[PDB]
Amino acid sequence: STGSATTTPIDSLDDAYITPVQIGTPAQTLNLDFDTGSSDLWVFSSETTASEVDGQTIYTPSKSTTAKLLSGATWSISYGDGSSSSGDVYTDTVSVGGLTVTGQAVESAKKVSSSFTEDSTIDGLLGLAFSTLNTVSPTQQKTFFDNAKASLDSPVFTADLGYHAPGTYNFGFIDTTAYTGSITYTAVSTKQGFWEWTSTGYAVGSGTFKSTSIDGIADTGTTLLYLPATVVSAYWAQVSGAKSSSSVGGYVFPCSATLPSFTFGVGSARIVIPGDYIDFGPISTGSSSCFGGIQSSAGIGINIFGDVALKAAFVVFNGATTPTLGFASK
């Protein structure tokens, strides 16, 4: 079996992408943020603190004939940006683009942090990293991808994010019409539970490619590209007037400047990120200072190939017994 769903940016800056997911019987449609950097499928629900809900569609397990309380199981998660959520756990039928999984753990949020309440477009997260990162206790739960794997034509899912436009998440097949050339595959380390891989280098604009190993994770749930201080400083040194601002929280540049492209290495292949993808607009309404899409990973401890990098390529997440990441130009 296969699945295919459209993913849409929540705003004009591509801060996050939302994908409709059907939960329960009869279906309750919620717009979830597909996150390859986490492993919990959690949703806003009828059990979430009423003051912490600001416009989201909520899951109501009491209206689902297939929902069941997973007695005694709880979950608690905290993300890299500081945001967090917690609550109890249900099992229910979950379908993504026609691909159905019965008995999926659906984590019902009782408490959500300010960041989630503020984002009215996002009803929850669908974790797509390895099930070892799942926060359900005492019994750990599997991700939707891990539960659908036996039923899939191929144990893969593909990410094809659009730049200020809709994209696609496919499960169980590789659309050979969605990319150009060939797909370059590279090894994945599952030691930390992420889709962790090694980039073979980088180039800034029309400059010479620098061959160096950058260990990082393919993360659909992170907006920006977070790379070592050395690489990020080499990039922003090519932008007139760009500087790292402590009050803003990273590199800012004059909105009138043109941004060079950024190239990253996948084996012997190169993925080119256009300069336009690195522009995140004014730091505040009316400001002439713009926020950069390439930031240092120094304070985080891990390099992140977020949506900025991922949207420049057709990305294959191969969840076979020996996992690999495939990259192709599009």
Swiss-Prot record:
The active site is at residues 35, 199. It comes from the Eukaryota. Keywords: Aspartyl protease, Disulfide bond, Hydrolase, Protease, Signal, Zymogen. Its EC number is 3.4.23.22. Residues 17-328 form the Peptidase A1 domain. Coiled coil: none annotated. GO terms for molecular function: aspartic-type endopeptidase activity. Disulfide bonds join 255-290. It catalyses: Hydrolysis of proteins with specificity similar to that of pepsin A, prefers hydrophobic residues at P1 and P1', but does not cleave 14-Ala-|-Leu-15 in the B chain of insulin or Z-Glu-Tyr. Clots milk. One of its GO terms (biological process) is proteolysis. Belongs to the peptidase A1 family. This is Endothiapepsin. It comes from Cryphonectria parasitica. The gene is EAPA.
